[PDB]
Amino acid sequence: HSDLTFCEIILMEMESHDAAWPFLEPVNPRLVSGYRRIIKNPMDFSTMRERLLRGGYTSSEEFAADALLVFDNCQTFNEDDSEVGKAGHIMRRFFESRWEEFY
Numbered sequence: 001h002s003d004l005t006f007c008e009i010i011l012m013e014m015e016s017h018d019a020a021w022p023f024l025e026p027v028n029p030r031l032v033s034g035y036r037r038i039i040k041n042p043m044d045f046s047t048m049r050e051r052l053l054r055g056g057y058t059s060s061e062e063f064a065a066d067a068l069l070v071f072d073n074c075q076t077f078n079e080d081d082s083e084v085g086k087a088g089h090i091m092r093r094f095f096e097s098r099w100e101e102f103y
């Protein structure tokens with residue numbers, strides 16, 4: 001319904017955001033040491049993309065839960081002053097403000 005039409009706007013705008021590069025694809029645990037043991041429920045934009053296209057979101061609140069999970073995992077694994085962590089705060093602050101402009 002009208003809830004999930006804006007989830008497409010935010011996800012599209014989040015995908016094309018400049019600071020979205022750490023979260024476009026799922027984290028590769030073979031390449032990132034310690035990520036498999038620290039992050040229980042990983043989540044990224046592409047995973048939210050394929051679920052949203054298939055329709056697996058019942059309400060907008062599920063979409064926000066996956067989005068906040070991306071930045072929670074980013075803050076949990078990475079330092080705040082790291083290159084991945086710096087982009088996470090930019091993407092997180094962009095989402096919470098853009099999510100505010102509708103709800």
Ligand SMILES: Cn1cc(C(=O)NCCN2CCCC2)ccc1=O
Pocket residue numbers: 021022023027032073074077078084
């Ligand atoms: C979300 N996240 C991402 C990384 C990462 O190193 N991403 C590199 C992504 N590749 C660089 C250019 C092509 C894709 C590390 C920790 C983390 O939590």
